[PDB]
Symmetry: D2
Subunit: 347 residues, 4 copies
């Protein structure tokens, strides 16, 4: 897979601002734009349809949605609709849901409910649910009728009228953190969205993606390994680094101990950070974030530093660098700084 840059925006801000930033990213050479799917924010279909209207080249899609909060045939319809309206630019980001959001919604997490197979009662693994949603979506994109009986979803004979433009050429990316999801993604996905920003995370993740690819007779180069990063760039390195703190603080808090161990993180001023958060004291949280946490969980600094860090990620197997929150002290100026002083070094 060729090297590319993506942008991931949480749609909590005004939809028109989110659309405007995606146009700035397109104008600056970014090739992918991912919009998160959480009920508490503006809906990905509304925000991406508005972004589709305001852009012409960048690929657009949910990053990431899930098999549970909407029937897979509804997700298929959304993707086909976004693809048609955008002139064939849709992409799919699919994951297993997320704990913080599912707890708020009232859904269990991991969610093992065979929600869309009414006659089943047996729990279903999230990786299996994702495989099934994928089959339903692509049967829909091929024009149907969709006929699928799995453990998590069982359809009737579902005819399809809506047509996309790319059809089954729409890329399927899977969110993956653990070994099971990483292996499944190497087997069935066009790409993998890994929430990580450091080469060490990919030295661990890529071999597992490759293991799944081999079992499917695929080469690792058929898979776009996308790093969903905490990213911060500014001509003033100190300012860029400072902007990452609140985000890194939350990352440190939600990182399993093997991840903290991997990055040699002060497990003391960790969780101690988790106590500052949840307590609503983000001020002490930010104060506790040190240089090792910033190096482990973000790509931050001036263009030179950022370019150096991306070179190391690419060596570790990353092929799509997704610029995520905070992006930079000023999001728009940050995107432009990436297009002007980072992307040209990788063309």
């Amino acid at each position: 897979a060729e090297v590319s840059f993506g942008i991931e925006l949480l749609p909590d801000d005004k939809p028109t601002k989110i659309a405007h930033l995606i146009k700035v990213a397109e104008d600056n050479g970014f090739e992918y734009a991912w919009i998160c799917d959480h009920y508490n924010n503006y809906s990905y279909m509304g925000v991406l349809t508005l972004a589709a209207v305001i852009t012409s080249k960048i690929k657009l899609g949910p990053g990431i949605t899930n098999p549970y909060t909407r029937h897979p045939l509804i997700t298929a319809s959304n993707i086909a609709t976004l693809d048609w309206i955008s002139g064939g630019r849709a992409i799919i980001g699919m994951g297993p849901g997320d704990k913080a959001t599912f707890d708020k919604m009232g859904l269990p997490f991991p969610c093992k409910i065979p929600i869309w197979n009414p006659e089943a009662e047996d729990e279903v693994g999230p990786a299996t649910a994702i495989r099934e949603v994928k089959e339903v979506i692509y049967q829909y994109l091929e024009g149907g009728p969709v006929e699928y009986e799995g453990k998590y979803v069982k359809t009737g004979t579902a005819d399809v009228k809506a047509r996309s433009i790319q059809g089954s050429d729409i890329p399927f990316y899977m969110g993956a953190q653990g070994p099971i999801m990483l292996k499944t993604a190497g087997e069935i996905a066009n790409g993998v969205l890994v929430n990580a920003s450091n080469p060490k995370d990919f030295e661990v993740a890529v071999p597992k993606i490759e293991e799944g690819a081999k079992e499917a007779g695929r080469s690792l180069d058929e898979i776009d390994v996308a790093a969903y990063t905490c990213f911060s760039i500014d001509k003033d390195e100190d300012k860029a680094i400072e902007a990452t703190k609140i985000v890194v603080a939350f990352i440190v808090m939600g990182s399993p101990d093997v991840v903290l161990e991997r990055h040699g993180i002060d497990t003391e001023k960790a969780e101690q950070i988790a106590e500052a958060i949840g307590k609503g004291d983000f001020g002490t949280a930010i104060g506790l974030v040190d240089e090792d946490m910033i190096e482990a969980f973000s790509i931050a600094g001036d263009p030179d530093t950022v370019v150096d860090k991306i070179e190391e990620l690419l060596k570790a197997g990353v092929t799509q660098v997704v610029v995520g929150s905070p992006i930079g002290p000023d999001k728009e100026k940050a995107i432009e700084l990436v297009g002007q002083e980072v992307i040209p070094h990788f063309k």
Copy 2:
């Protein structure tokens, strides 16, 4: 409620055509535009967001969506997003799902699964599910956090960031056919979407809506009674009538016997029509549709005939006339004929 005209479009056609027709309706004085929610067609969020971009005054919303195929917090987010993007023009159409579509999806119908309350197993009546989805949506529109524990949905503490423009002023319309849904709609809805086109249907339905309104201390005039009609208008009455046949044939097929009895329908050349359909022989189906079926199940003819029919519906309690399929031999010319020779008679 004041008299108004709405338009209902199935989004199976190109999204840009559907958006264009909604703009033509707005330009012609229609005040509501309803887009159906069926997985087999383009998604209502994509189509309505595109229509929102291409229009400025007409109210926009799903007509009708349901409590089952998406978590109610996702439906709330969709509505708040459409409202924000449209500058405060969203409306909600909520029903219990529909048999033809749910069978295709693999969901039972009626759907009594307490889908969004994982710890519950007991069946829940569709009217109760609709009441619960309504509470969740309006808690979301008030800014949350949404905290609701019902029989069909149980949430955690769901904070909300997305903000709409109308907030809880967004109108809530309920689809209703039977006595239980009609009474529930009079109790909790700003309006009722009744799939019918004849005064006799409303002479039966309105008293039941009124019964629910009284139990909630409301006057019937607080409720917009909307007729979701089979509508066909043309300067050539014969051409208008002919265009209704395929649609009336399907209506005749899916009408319970009390409805056929109500309209004195030839129960013989009924079901005989149902056999022509399902058999894929629509040609004999159309040939069987007679004048009584057309009078019972559509508003069809030249402007004079249409105006006369609407006057009788208004006398029966209808306050919003929703022009639905086929609309007319030429949909755009039909919409214009309504704006030029029908609406001015009712202003």
Copy 3:
């Protein structure tokens, strides 16, 4: 005329940012959005059409265009097109051109060329050119054919196919600074756009607008007197005031001596400012701007100060307060501060 708030944006920034800011203004209660017409920036038709797509209620139009750089029939077409696409929200801002821009283009200023009457050679006064362009535009909006023979424009029999939505109800605002333009605007315009921010300017201008209105048998209340202001608002008054300096410096430079005299301006540290500018030394320019210049040529400060200043403008006859550059240190936060803490005081 009722009290209203408008926003004026120079379209030198990204079109999507300009459109986004207009949506923020609409969401905050602004009722007018004016986009300047200068060849060096993005075109008003492109920017306003994009803004029309992203908004639903705010009125939109050029503020201000002119009779010279485009044939009046082309300007009419632009206005009818913007009106149709926006669902009947167009407004017209028409002035005589501007020296800085016309010099750059190569056109004389004042421009007295009977540009659009090929057989004429005699000079035509700008106020007469504006009267003629107005007649051509409204004949076009009435559906034509336009047939007009004046001193500045002579048409053939120009049929018109394009239709607007408001027709001749589209408001005609005239830019006016001197006595002749002010009187003409009171006679023929629905509103007047006066580049000024202080009550003293309106105590001079309003009586002249009123004189023209009386000669046309009109009451002054039929005319929307709009102040095109240098505006700066922030919760930190000092920060708001500082943001106005570069803009006030340019205003001081281009102000005729009667205006400087009117505001008791240090004519010494004036022109001395004009020498700093033109010399490219804006740093000394800003340093020279004092409190009297800021009070004379801008509405700047915290919400309390701003509200007090608007009250005095309204007493002087202003009915539309147009928030113009810089708007505030952060344009979007400034617009929101106006919607939250200024507009509600005037409702």
Copy 4:
């Protein structure tokens, strides 16, 4: 130049319909969309900006605009704005104006007024005016400042802030009918828009375009020779042919005698057609159009016939086939028939 298909739409219809048809063309493989520039219709900037929002791949631009009705710096701004909003898809179509429209506007035709050089009085040839407008536009697209002193336009030092995306890569197409314009286009244009639909017209035109190209050291293959055709396609050849009549009737009327001679046209039932038109009797006009006129002035018939006709045009040097009015009995179905049964034969 590679073979491509374009679509040319007169914007007299609803802007949203024109935008929708351009999206249908894009979805069907058309690579260019041209919108005429006549004051009596909706403005090209409004219609193309709306089309830009609704499309993502097709190239968009005025086809054709002119040097006279707007200052060339305003045309430059329009093009840069359309290019930016469309994500770098703008194209320029530039011609000398047109008699029917200029007479209606009151401008002479040919228009030889040095309109934009106030100190000049000497007449300027239209080909020279087009060369000058081209220089001004590209200086603007290079970022300026534009400084140009010609016979038809003389600017001051015109700085430029607006930026396009393609910069000087935006293609410049010139409308050309006669020898002088054809030669000029071969010398200075990326393409030529020739109003003709038959191989004989191109056997005459191409050598002249080639003569200009050689004088500029260019190969004929650097020039996209675009046929602006009267086009009509339908699965029913007779229906397709019938749809061309009104349009061919007008073409026959406005064709110089050398063109009528070239196509062996009955000069009797010609002008006799011109008398039916202008007299408002289009019914006799259509009745007079014969097979030779249809063969000479349109590409009409079923897909097989159309494909055969395009093959002959390509042999005559055409490289872009522009489908123009009527397009087909049903414009949308016609566009789809071209994408499904014509374009694939030429890929």
